[PDB]
Amino acid sequence: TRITLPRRPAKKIQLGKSRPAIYHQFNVKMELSDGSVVIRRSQYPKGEIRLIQDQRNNPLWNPSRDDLVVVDANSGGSLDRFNKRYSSLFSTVELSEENKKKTQ
Amino acid sequence: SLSPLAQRVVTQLSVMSASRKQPKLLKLAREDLIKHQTIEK
Amino acid sequence: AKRVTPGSLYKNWTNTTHTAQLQQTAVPLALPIFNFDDISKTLNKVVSYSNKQYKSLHHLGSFKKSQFNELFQKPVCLVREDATNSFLKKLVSHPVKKFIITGEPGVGKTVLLSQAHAYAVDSKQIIINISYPELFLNGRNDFSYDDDLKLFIQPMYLKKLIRKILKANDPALLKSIELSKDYKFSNANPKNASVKPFVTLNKTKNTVLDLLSVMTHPHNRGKLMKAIIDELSVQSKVPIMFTVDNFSKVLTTAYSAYRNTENKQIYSLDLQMGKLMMDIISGETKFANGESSTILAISGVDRTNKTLPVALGKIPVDPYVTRYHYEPKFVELLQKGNVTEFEVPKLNKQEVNELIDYYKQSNVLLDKDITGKKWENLIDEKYFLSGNGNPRELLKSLVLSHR
Amino acid sequence: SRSVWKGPNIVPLPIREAMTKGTPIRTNARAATILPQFVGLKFQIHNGKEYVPIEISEDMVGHKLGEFAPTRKRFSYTQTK
Amino acid sequence: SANQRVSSDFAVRLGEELTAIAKGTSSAFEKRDQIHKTAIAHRAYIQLK
RNA sequence: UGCAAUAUGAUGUAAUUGGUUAACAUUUUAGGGUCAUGACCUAAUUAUAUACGUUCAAAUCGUAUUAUUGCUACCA
RNA sequence: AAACUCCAUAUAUAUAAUUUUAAUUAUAUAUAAUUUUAUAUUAUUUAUUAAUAUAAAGAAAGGAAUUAAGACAAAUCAUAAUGAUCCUUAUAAUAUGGGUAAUAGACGUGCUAUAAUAAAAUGAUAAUAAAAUUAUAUAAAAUAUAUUUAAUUAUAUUUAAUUAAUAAUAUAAAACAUUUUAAUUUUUAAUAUAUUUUUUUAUUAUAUAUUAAUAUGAAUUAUAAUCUGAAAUUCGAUUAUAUGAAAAAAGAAUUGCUAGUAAUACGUAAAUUAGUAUGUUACGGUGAAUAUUCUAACUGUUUCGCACUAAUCACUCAUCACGCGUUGAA
Ligand SMILES: Nc1nc2c(ncn2[C@@H]2O[C@H](COP(=O)(O)OP(=O)(O)OP(=O)(O)O)[C@@H](O)[C@H]2O)c(=O)[nH]1
Ligand SMILES: [Mg+2]
Ligand SMILES: [Mg+2]
Ligand SMILES: [Mg+2]
Ligand SMILES: [Mg+2]
Ligand SMILES: [Mg+2]
Ligand SMILES: [Mg+2]
Ligand SMILES: [Mg+2]
Ligand SMILES: [Mg+2]
Ligand SMILES: [Mg+2]
Ligand SMILES: [Mg+2]
Ligand SMILES: [Mg+2]
Ligand SMILES: [Mg+2]
Ligand SMILES: [Mg+2]
Ligand SMILES: [Mg+2]
Ligand SMILES: [Mg+2]
Ligand SMILES: [Mg+2]
Ligand SMILES: [Mg+2]
Ligand SMILES: [Mg+2]
Ligand SMILES: [Mg+2]
Ligand SMILES: [Mg+2]
Incomplete structure (x- = not known):
């Protein structure tokens, strides 16, 4: 019932002729949420990449900072449309109007 | 006769393998070998 | 697989009757020839066109579908005296010659146009006919935008129309005209294509007969037609009927x-192909020759709006009508040129009588109206069924309606 | 879909205790919309006989509280053959 | 017999078939003939009621 | 140290001078049903077993797999 | 049972000062038909007779309401009312929600398809109706946006006129001209043709390559958004871009219709609503063909049998299982 691809007769790699494995890697630049950049070795042919969510904008790794904005992927799903759809209500008036319910 | 999944995994294991991807052995002259020995020391 | 053997009728009824030679079996009959100078001699007679008129009226497209032109050897007309004579007479004697033919569906608005074209070929005039204008307004042809001539051009229809003009009009009348300007076009002729990229014309040494013959590229065909029409406008030797x-x-x-x-x-x-056609009716394109003449004809296969009634003065102007039903620019273009209408009167009992006589002679009637009917009763009944003189309804009563 | 110009459907429900303390909001108002202010609050939505607990995620905003409290549970045909 | 032709218009097909029958190239004469032969065969069963 | 025949099923089954389907039957599909028993339809399974030759035809001759016949050895 | 009756038919008479015009109309009354004669032929209770023939005169031809007695202990105690019972801090009252709406195989009755004797787009001096609704209403024109000249369809903004033979719902729609329309190399281009020009005849391309999988179908989904309502989540109808499934006319069997009927990709109005019909109830448009020889199936009577009579769902024959009695034999 199992599916497997057949084993071909392995080529014999003689004693002393066995070379190491050096896969092709690029010196890729990786930008964090802040302006910091780290050079690293990657096998993907992309020399440059930036991150939107990472260590530099996580509360657990950033306890001391007072203000810390969070963000997610853009142009995907229906995110932020729950705000774009309602323009009449906008940002402290709602906070004041949410004072109490007076129910018991 | 193979499946498209079989082809995909064969490509993945091609990326694994060293066949048809490694360059020639590095053979250095005697003088450059001595240079390299000094570098490493 | 290919079940359509050559020579088999596969199109609709109208297309089959129009294209298939249903007149190959028609009966030959000696009839008078259509000539205006002999109109007093053939005032009320079902007369056939001459070979000149038949070769023309074909490239021009004067004979159309759904006319029962296949019941006879070739199309024929009744001449009449209140439509053909009454129209051509004023066409000859009116200071400004631009008319529009109106009437009810089936009256003979086309046939009168074809008679006018026959008169033109008889009277040695260069004829330009556009016939069905839906072809260049429907979207089934190619177009482009010309930077110099700031308009859209339609090379396929332009080629067809120039070929119509050249193939219909008389080589002698066309060659009689000499060019006034020098025109330089691109070359699209496979012969001498590589040697010369542009063909050239010269003043008073070439003619319109080969001006039409030159073959240029689609993008330059618009300028080609501009040259055709402008040269024909500035010529004053032979009349041009549009x-x-x-x-x-x-x-x-x-x-x-x-x-x-x-x-x-x-x-x-x-x-x-709309600007050219409208500037001539409006009067921007002035023809030097005295008797150029312009004729228009409406059709009953087309919706009606207030544009034409307002242009012809049949009703007042209502400015609140929507553009889909009233077009002040078209009205203004029509009114700037003093176009006058011409409603084709319907047939009389005597006209029906002569038409039915000819139909009997040509054997397109039935035992129903040949055996048990008296001529007076037959003519009265058909005049009554044809809506008191509608030619199409008369033909439909006689031939199509079998019960 | 409720017309946007009317504004979101909002019902009086207690949120001040929900933020100041950890008290969950138990309610039968299944037709109320999940505004951006409820994220992180624990709700107990009535399903017909019992209150189902749910935590509000940033994606639930714009939906109705009653979409995550199924009222009827799945059908199972007992063939016995 | 007219529906076995090519024209997309029933009027054209029917006119073609009627023309064929007028010139005597119908494909149902054999049906008439078979029915008539069967009647000739069953003449005996006739019983004036 | 050589050779023989088997299977389209949920219950086996066509046959002989060359192109194409190989019953039943089984089953909720079910016949005709006065709501009704209890005789097709409708509802399941062949793909000439992976090879070799030919005219626009190979079930037909070899080998080989699902494996139970009958001789010789039977003074090892 | 027929007649009497209501909707329809014809005629008259009376009302409308023909600007509630539909006088081609409205509805009050009466008349008429459940049609009359004349010769023909078969016949035949003899002429007093029917079935036909059809010269004649008449406008004259339909429809629905009414379905008895007995029955099937047919349906209804959920339209309401009721006898017996059975709940009385419930089996009686209120609100918040969730049920009625779930989905394996079945089964009815309908809607929409599967293309060319047929489906879309246009038809402004607006081709042609009937019957209804509007004080718990109705929505004309007009202006804005979806979408660019318009128009057409959806929403908003204003609400005109009319409680209505007067405004409005509402320019019926199919027919009928025109354009198109895949399977289809049955096509479209390029040049040439010529008396088919909205067109045909040539030579090339339109050929993964002729017997079903679109430019048919609109189910199922994604996302804006809009109506009504306090509120569509479970569960309401809408336009917009996208999505584009099954279906290539259907097996035993089977349904309705005999004329203004069936059929109709013909539409129209009302009831039930704050809102939502593929249902119900009504109105008109266009309009068929088929029939005088079958076994069967129901009935109204009839004739033959009857041991049934709360009557064939009748009644009624045993030995074997249960208890008690009496007599044989031995
Ligand atoms: N002999 C003869 N036939 C005529 C005449 N006029 C009309 N007919 C016939 O009647 C038909 C009427 O069609 P047309 O002549 O196109 O009439 P129309 O009024 O132009 O028609 P639409 O354009 O469709 O409104 C013609 O095709 C002829 O068959 C005439 O003068 N003589
Ligand atoms: Mg015309
Ligand atoms: Mg021994
Ligand atoms: Mg009665
Ligand atoms: Mg009764
Ligand atoms: Mg019951
Ligand atoms: Mg009660
Ligand atoms: Mg229900
Ligand atoms: Mg029913
Ligand atoms: Mg269709
Ligand atoms: Mg449709
Ligand atoms: Mg109309
Ligand atoms: Mg009315
Ligand atoms: Mg309006
Ligand atoms: Mg239409
Ligand atoms: Mg479609
Ligand atoms: Mg739908
Ligand atoms: Mg659906
Ligand atoms: Mg309603
Ligand atoms: Mg009786
Ligand atoms: Mg009885």
């Missing part, structure tokens, strides 16, 4: 199906 049939389509379809590069629909006047 004719458009089914003018209702153009005066009701202001915006073509041709769509601009931004979803807009291109305006008919913004599109060439």
Whole structure:
């Protein structure tokens, strides 16, 4: 019932002729949420990449900072449309109007 | 006769393998070998 | 697989009757020849055209579908005296010669146009006929935008129309005209294509006969037609008669199906083959020759709006009507040139009598009206069934309606 | 879909205790919309006989509280053959 | 017999078939003939009621 | 140290001078049903077993797999 | 049972000062038909007779309401009312929600398809109706946006006129001209043709390559958004872009219709609503063909049998299982 691809007769790699494995890697630049950049070795042919969510904008790794904005992927799903759809209500008036319910 | 999944995994294991991807052995002259020995020391 | 053997009728009824030679079996009959100078001699007679008129009226497209032109060897006309004579007489004697033919569906608006074309070929005139204007306004042809001639051009229809003009009009009459300007076009002729990229014309040494013959590229064919019409406008030797049939389509379809590069629909006047055709009726294109003459004809296969009634003065002007049903620019273009109408009167009992006589002679009637009917009763009944003199209804009663 | 110009459907429900303390909001108002202010609050939505607990995620905003409290549970045909 | 022709218009097909029958190239004469032969065969069963 | 025949099923089954389907039957599909028993339809399974030759035809001759016949050895 | 009756038919008479015009109309009364004669032929209770023939005169031809007695202990105690019972801090009252709406195989009755004797787009001196609704209403024109000249369809903004033979719902729609329309190389281009020009005849391309999988179908989904309502989540109808499934006319069997009927990709109005019909109830448009020889199936009577009579769902024959009695034999 199992599916497997057949084993071909392995080529014999003689004693002393066995070379190491050096896969092709690029010196890729990786930008964090802040302006910091780290050079690293990657096998993907992309020399440059930036991150939107990472260590530099996580509360657990950033306890001391007072203000810390969070963000997610853009142009995907229906995110932020729950705000774009309602323009009449906008940002402290709602906070004041949410004072109490007076129910018991 | 193979499946498209079989082809995909064969490509993945091609990326694994060293066949048809490694360059020639590095053979250095005697003088450059001595240079390299000094570098490493 | 290919079940359509050659020579088998596969199109609709109308197309089959129109294209298939249903007249190969028709009966030959000696009839008078259509000539205006002998109109007093053939005032009320079912007369046939001459070979000149038949070779013409064909390239021009004077004979159409759904006319029962196949019941006879070749198309024939009754001449009449209140439509053909009453029209051609004023055409000859009217200071400004531009008319539009109106009437009810089936009256003979086309046949009268064909009679006018026959008179033109008889009277040695250069004829331009556009016939069905839906072809260049429907969107089934190619177009482009000409930077110099700031208009849209339609190379396929332009080629067809220039070929119509050249193949119909007389080589002698066309060669009699000498060019006034020098025109330089591109070359699209396979012969001498590589040697010369542009063909050249010269003043008073070439003629319109080969001006039409030159073959240019699609993008330059618009300028080609501009040259044709401008030279024919400045010539003053032989008259030029310009004719458009089914003018209702153009005066009701202001915006073509041709769509601009931004979803807009291109305006008919913004599109060439409408500007050329409208400037001549309006009077921007002046023909030097005295008796050029212009004729238009509406069709009953087209919707009606207030444009034509307001242009002809049949009703007042209502400015609140929507553009889909009233077009002040078209009205203004029609009124700037003093176009006058011409309603084709319906047939009389005597006209029906002569038509039925000819139909009997040609054997297109039935035992029903040949055996048990007396001529007076038959003519009265058909005159009554034809809506008191509608030729199409008369033919349908006689031939099509079998029970 | 409720017309946007009317504004979101909002019902009086207690949120001040929900933020100041950890008290969950138990309610039968299944037709109320999940505004951006409820994220992180624990709700107990009535399903017909019992209150189902749910935590509000940033994606639930714009939906109705009653979409995550099924009222009827799945059908199972007992063939016995 | 007219529906076995090519024209997309029933009027054209029917006119073609009627023309064929007028010139005597119908494909149902054999049906008439078979029915008539069967009647000739069953003449005996006739019983004036 | 050589050779023989088997299977389209949920219950086996066509046959002989060359192109194409190989019953039943089984089953909720079910016949005709006065709501009704209890005789097709409708509802399941062949793909000439992976090879070799030919005219626009190979079930037909070899080998080989699902494996139970009958001789010789039977003074090892 | 027929007649009497209501909707329809014809005629008259009376009302409308023909600007509630539909006088081609409205509805009050009466008349008429459940049609009359004349010769023909078969016949035949003899002429007093029917079935036909059809010269004649008449406008004259339909429809629905009414379905007895007995029955099937047919349906209804959920339209309401009721006898017996059975709940009385419930089996009686209120609100918040969730049920009635779930989905394996079945089964009815309908809607929409599967293309060319047929489906879309246009038809402004607006081709042609009937019957209804509007004080718990109705929505004309007009202006804005979806979408660019318009128009057409959806929403908003204003609400005109009319409680209505007067405004409005509402320019019926199919027919009928025109254009198109894949399977289809049955097509479209390029040049040439010529008396088919909205067209045909040539030579090339339109050929993964002729017997079903679109430019048919609109189910199922994604996302804006809009109506009504306090509120569509479970569960309401809408336009917009996208999505584009099954279906290539259907097996035993089977349904309705005999004329203004069936059929109709013909539409129209009302009831039930704050809102939502593929249902119900009504109105008109266009309009068929088929029939005088079958076994069967129901009935109204009839004739033959009857041991049934709360009557064939009748009644009624045993030995074997249960208890008690009496007599044989031995
Ligand atoms: N002999 C003869 N036939 C005529 C005449 N006029 C009309 N007919 C016939 O009647 C038909 C009427 O069609 P047309 O002549 O196109 O009439 P029309 O009024 O132009 O028609 P639409 O354009 O469709 O409104 C013609 O095709 C002829 O068959 C005439 O003068 N003589
Ligand atoms: Mg015409
Ligand atoms: Mg021994
Ligand atoms: Mg009665
Ligand atoms: Mg009764
Ligand atoms: Mg019951
Ligand atoms: Mg009660
Ligand atoms: Mg229900
Ligand atoms: Mg029913
Ligand atoms: Mg169709
Ligand atoms: Mg449709
Ligand atoms: Mg109309
Ligand atoms: Mg009315
Ligand atoms: Mg309006
Ligand atoms: Mg239509
Ligand atoms: Mg479609
Ligand atoms: Mg739908
Ligand atoms: Mg659906
Ligand atoms: Mg309603
Ligand atoms: Mg009786
Ligand atoms: Mg009885």
